Amino acid sequence: TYMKIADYGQLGEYTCDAKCDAEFGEPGNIRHLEGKTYDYRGVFCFNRKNLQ
Amino acid sequence: EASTIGPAFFTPQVLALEVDCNIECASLLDLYGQIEVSRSTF
């Protein structure tokens, strides 16, 4: 699994220079998603004399 | 795979015998009276 940071939020706002507080902003998402892995296999035979 | 693939991939070891199987006789030569000629008529 791995992280997927989606979109940074809008944090600051350029407020007026009188108020004693900020103003909330939108958040960001991270979306911890996963993914699997496959396998590959097969076989093959032989005689023993017919290979010597 | 197994022997369904050509008769040319298997090199046969060539051994070094040689059967003859024929037959000669003995010889009555030494018994006969030896003699030596030089022309073609004596």
TrEMBL record, chain B:
This is Major capsid protein. It comes from the Viruses. The chain holds residues 166 to 207 of 465 of the full protein.
